[PDB]
């Protein structure tokens, strides 16, 4: 139905109930309300319409004062159609932001209050102050700094030939433009000057200008040459004339506007009182295994309770003493429970739960604690406990199972884990063996003790072996913990590569993570971006809410808008996961508060995303009943509705916020009538140029994280190759998870799949029909370079699942791989061989039988490509290690990482590795003929 009856609560106590249109804006509803109110009592005591604001209860259960009255009631989306008039006055800016945050981050901000938690409340106090302040300091800086913040430089890696080519520059609010020639090695200041000279023909300074690539939020500035910019690099390669606009600084300003722990030598213990809401088999009996942990390793032996009979509310009431003293517990000591169901005496993991012993203020937890457990999932490892599992409580306190335990009072005063000054106190005072150390470090219980004895030598001569020396340390003895922490203070700064290793769950200590972040501060924004996905997943390993890694990510998010955008979506797309909903919720709130400009961008994207979900659901409801042409017509009729059209129109692309999705081309929109039924949405932009058309695929039903991870890794290789002067013409198109099994994929235009193009020498003739005459030599070189790149990439990453309909080719000649579903050999797995395909090998050789000259160049590209990845092999191992946090089925253990060790052959030397690669190559060249 079109209309809807809305309840209206007037400030006099009077009540009105009349129908309004779902499409009416709130400004129109006030007018109608006032018109109706005049015929109800107490009207003469109301002030004017403009004196009041509507209030509603939004979908997240909070009062929201509806300041923007150009919004439709269907866009406001109140819980029940109920609006209350209230006084405008107050702190309207704080109230507006808090509501917008709740709606954007998914969770209502009241739910953080509802918890009654010091750690949450302290986190929200400290970070929101930090982010608000950083945003305030950002405003007081100049337009240049703001331009660097908002539109950071997009450069080509290495951040040679000096040919000349034309370039179009103009000024804002002017149809006419001045075309002129410049060189590739010119700085951007020199380009502006010629435009300002061309301006001064009949008739300012260059330093009060920047160049905007028109149709985009992408600006050319700084002390880099014109060639190093991605636009001019993409223009000079393609041949298109680079269009630019001269923006004034004022126009950029327009956009901008005493008890000791070690004295207590008593053994550790807990009272195990009760279970709760336990759903097990009544014939069986319940047992609770408990174990202390510091990372993956145990601090002492794992104790157990007695066998009580299975019921909803089992009652144990037992002391469970452990083989460790209260003084010996390290800062990150982690008590870990698992409730098991066992058969009648003379195993079913029911649930599990973990608890940090010390709290966030460093105090040892005392008294009763109710751990709402997480349900155990059967896995291949078959472990007893889940020490790597999350430390937060299960949010489903309504129906989830619980274990009631009580950590007893260790002393009358509250005892804390000692401060750094007293840690360094204990740590301060305390040719032959060097040969064995070299051999062990530069390559077990014997070896670990040698690493411990010569730890000063490890610090002195083997600084990069810090991770090894950490894992050999005995964290269940406080003397040993002090000594290792003492060395850590004076430990020399490690490179980014070594720091990444230290962010893994194996190193839970706060000082280690702090050291790790201390070494990641040298990251430039470009390189941070390559690891952002990995860093966000590591947040799931953190014990406490406030951590050095969280501060780091927010700092970089607030200093670079592009980084914050992707930080936001990475976090936002996991808010459906109870494990991280709270943690991620709190980081997103802090971000928003220091990023009110980008909130308006993110708000627009969210409502674009919300309409597409609805639009895809309608297409799913329609495609089962009706055929495609009618459903395609019915998709457009929905899209052309004001609510839809305005929401989908005029937004920054989530996949790239510099791309401007302006006018949706409804005629060119469509969907694929198989599988999850992904929407194909096309946009236009007359200000842009030849690449004025852009596309997005909205898919809802698959989890896009593994497709993003794989795409991200191919992008990394492409950067790593480019840095050594090798461009293999890859297409690492964008892929962004935005929600629960929901995301956007960047459309690569002017491309079909090999399967569709093949419907004798079909690919060679297709490339002829897209590159006739002298263009064909480009297309084959684009094919050969790219084919080599994706041959190596898919080999190294262990990518199965390849076939004619998930490899695509571009009209330029470039071959590229899409829709990555499986990797690292993978559910059982086998080694994927290196795979040459006859049809590709046919195109590479220009359609001949034997073309040894060309084929050797292709052989060389593969060898060189593969050799370069080997030089950065540890980067891939470390990055993949941290992705185990993501809980991907195919990336969840040490053997999944071992696949990359073997495929890159890190255990072999550089000569020996390339000899094996040749054998795999040739065998692939032979196997391409055989089998039919």
């Amino acid at each position: 139905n079109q209309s809807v009856v809305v309840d209206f609560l007037l400030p006099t106590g009077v009540y009105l109930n009349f129908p309004v249109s779902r499409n009416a804006n709130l400004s129109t509803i006030k007018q109608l309300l006032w018109h109706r109110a005049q015929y109800e009592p107490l009207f003469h005591m109301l002030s004017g319409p403009e004196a009041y604001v509507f209030t509603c209860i939004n979908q997240t259960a909070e009062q929201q004062e509806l300041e923007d009255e150009q919004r439709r009631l269907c866009d406001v989306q109140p819980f029940l159609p109920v609006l209350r008039l209230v006084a405008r006055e107050g702190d309207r800016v704080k109230k507006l932001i808090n509501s917008q945050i709740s709606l954007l981050i998914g969770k209502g901000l009241h739910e953080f209050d509802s918890l009654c938690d010091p750690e949450v409340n302290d986190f929200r106090a400290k970070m929101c102050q930090f982010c608000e302040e950083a945003a305030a300091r950002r405003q007081q800086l100049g337009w240049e700094a703001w331009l660097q913040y908002s539109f950071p430089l997009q450069l080509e890696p290495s951040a040679l030939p000096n040919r000349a080519l034309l370039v179009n520059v103009k000024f804002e609010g002017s149809e006419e433009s001045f075309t002129f020639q410049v060189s590739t090695k010119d700085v951007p200041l020199a380009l502006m000057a010629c435009a300002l000279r061309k301006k001064a023909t009949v008739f300012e300074q260059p330093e009060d200008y920047t160049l905007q690539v028109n149709g985009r939020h992408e600006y050319l500035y700084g002390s880099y040459p014109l060639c190093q910019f991605q636009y001019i690099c993409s223009c000079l390669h393609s041949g298109l004339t680079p269009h630019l606009t001269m923006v004034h600084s004022s126009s950029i300003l327009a956009m901008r506007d005493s008890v000791s722990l070690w004295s207590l030598e008593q053994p550790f213990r807990i009272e195990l009182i009760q279970g709760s809401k336990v759903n097990a088999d009544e014939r069986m009996k319940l047992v609770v295994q408990a174990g202390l942990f510091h990372g993956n390793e145990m601090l002492c032996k794992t104790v157990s309770s007695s066998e009580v009979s299975v019921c909803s509310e089992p009652v144990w009431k037992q002391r469970l003493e452990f083989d460790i003293n209260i003084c010996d517990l390290p800062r990150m000591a982690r008590l870990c429970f698992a409730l098991y169901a066992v058969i009648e005496k003379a195993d079913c993991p029911i649930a599990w739960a973990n608890l940090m012993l010390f709290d966030y203020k460093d105090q040892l937890k005392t008294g009763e604690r109710c751990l709402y457990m997480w349900p155990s999932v059967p896995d291949e490892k078959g472990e007893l406990l889940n020490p790597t599992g999350t430390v937060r409580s299960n949010p489903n306190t309504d129906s989830a199972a619980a274990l009631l335990i009580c950590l007893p009072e260790v002393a009358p005063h509250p005892v804390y884990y000692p401060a750094l000054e007293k840690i360094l106190e204990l740590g301060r005072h305390s040719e032959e063996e060097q040969l064995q150390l070299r051999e062990i470090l530069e390559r077990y219980e014997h070896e670990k003790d040698l690493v411990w004895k010569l730890r000063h030598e490890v610090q002195e001569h083997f600084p990069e072996a810090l991770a090894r020396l950490l894992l050999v340390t005995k964290w269940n003895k406080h003397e040993d913990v002090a000594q290792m922490l003492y060395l850590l203070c004076s430990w020399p700064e490690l490179p980014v590569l070594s720091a990444l290793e230290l962010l893994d769950f194996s190193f839970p200590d706060c000082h280690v993570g702090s050291f790790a972040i201390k070494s990641l501060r040298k990251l430039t924004d470009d390189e941070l971006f390559q690891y952002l996905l990995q860093l966000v997943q590591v947040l799931k390993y953190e014990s406490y809410l406030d951590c050095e890694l969280t501060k780091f990510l927010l700092d970089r998010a607030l200093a670079n808008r592009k980084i914050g955008h992707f930080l936001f979506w990475h976090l936002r797309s996991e808010m459906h996961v109870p494990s991280v909903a709270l943690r991620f919720g709190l980081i997103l709130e802090a971000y928003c508060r220091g990023s009110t400009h980008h909130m308006k961008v993110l708000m627009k994207q969210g409502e674009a995303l919300s309409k597409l979900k609805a639009l895809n659901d309608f297409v799913k409801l329609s495609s089962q009943k009706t055929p495609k042409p009618q459903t395609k017509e019915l998709m457009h009729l929905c899209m052309r509705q004001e609510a839809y059209l305005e929401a989908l129109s005029h937004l920054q692309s989530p996949l790239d916020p510099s791309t401007l999705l302006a006018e949706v081309c409804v005629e060119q929109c469509t969907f694929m009538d198989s599988k999850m039924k992904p929407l194909w949405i096309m946009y236009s932009n007359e200000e842009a140029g030849s690449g004025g058309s852009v596309g997005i695929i909205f898919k809802n039903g698959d989890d896009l994280r593994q497709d993003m991870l794989t795409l991200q890794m191919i992008q990394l290789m492409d950067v790593l190759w480019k840095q050594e002067g090798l461009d293999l013409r890859m297409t690492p198109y964008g892929c962004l998870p935005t929600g629960d099994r929901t995301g956007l994929i960047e459309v690569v235009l002017r491309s079909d799949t090999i399967a569709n193009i093949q419907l004798k020498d079909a690919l060679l003739n297709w490339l002829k029909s897209k590159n006739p005459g002298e263009a064909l030599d480009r297309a084959i070189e684009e094919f050969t370079l790219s084919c080599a790149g994706y041959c190596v990439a898919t080999y190294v990453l262990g990518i199965g699942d390849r076939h004619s309909d998930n490899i695509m080719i571009r009209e330029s000649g470039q071959l590229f791989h899409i829709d990555f579903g499986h990797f690292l050999g993978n559910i059982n797995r086998e080694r994927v061989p290196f795979i040459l395909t006859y049809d590709f090998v046919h195109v590479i050789q220009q359609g001949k039988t034997n073309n040894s000259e060309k084929f050797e160049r292709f052989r060389g590209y593969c060898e060189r490509a593969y050799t370069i990845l080997r030089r950065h092999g540890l980067l891939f191992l470390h990055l993949f290690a941290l992705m185990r946090a993501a809980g991907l089925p195919e990336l969840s253990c040490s053997k999944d990482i071992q696949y990359l060790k073997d495929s890159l052959a890190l255990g072999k030397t550089e000569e020996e590795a390339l000899k094996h690669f040749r054998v795999k190559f040739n065998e692939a060249l032979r196997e391409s003929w055989k089998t039919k």
Binding site: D7, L9, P11, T12, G13, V14, Y15, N17, E40, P41, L42, M45, T55, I57, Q59, T60, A61, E62, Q63, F79, L80, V82, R84, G108, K277, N279, A280, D281, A341, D347, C348, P349, I350, P375, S376, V377, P378, E380, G382, P395, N396, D398, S399, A401, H576, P578, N828
Partner: protein, 160 residues
């Protein structure tokens, strides 16, 4: 005992493990789906509470605001003004009852779905021991045939 009879058992036990793995993974989808629906129901109830609460502030206002204003025309001039106000008030109170009835219905479904959540988990925890014991059995037979020296090709054809 013999390699054919053990390999034949490896095939039967793997099929049974694959079927049981599907049944658990199907039930686990329902545990998550139900888990999300209950949390949505829980927020909707808080939304009802917050709405009801706003209506009860309206009554407070209605009484406080009537009291003072009503005395000026309480038997002084027009008692028609009084009847419009109190009829309008009964219209407010009457709306609250519906919203309460709608809150009441969502409480009833949340109770019924809390029971459902609980029966999924109970059925999940009954399957786990058989799923695990079929995982170990499958693996022991694989280990036995590998020791006996059975080639990887022959193991593949048994595994599915």
């Amino acid at each position: 005992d013999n390699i054919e009879a053990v390999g034949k058992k490896l095939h039967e036990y793997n099929t049974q493990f694959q079927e049981k793995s599907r049944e658990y993974d199907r039930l686990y989808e329902d545990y998550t789906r139900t888990s999300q629906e209950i949390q949505m129901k829980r927020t909707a109830i808080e939304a009802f509470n917050e709405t009801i609460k706003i209506f009860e502030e309206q009554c407070q206002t209605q009484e406080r605001y009537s009291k003072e204003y009503i005395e000026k025309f309480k038997r002084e001039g027009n008692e028609t003004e009084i009847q419009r106000i109190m009829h309008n008030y009964e219209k407010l109170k009457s709306r609250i009852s519906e919203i309460v009835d709608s809150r009441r219905r969502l409480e009833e479904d949340l109770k019924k779905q809390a029971a459902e959540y609980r029966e999924i988990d109970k059925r999940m925890n009954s399957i786990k021991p058989d799923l695990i014991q079929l995982r170990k059995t499958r693996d022991q037979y694989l280990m036995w045939l590998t020791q006996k020296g059975v080639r990887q090709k022959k193991l593949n054809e048994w595994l599915g």
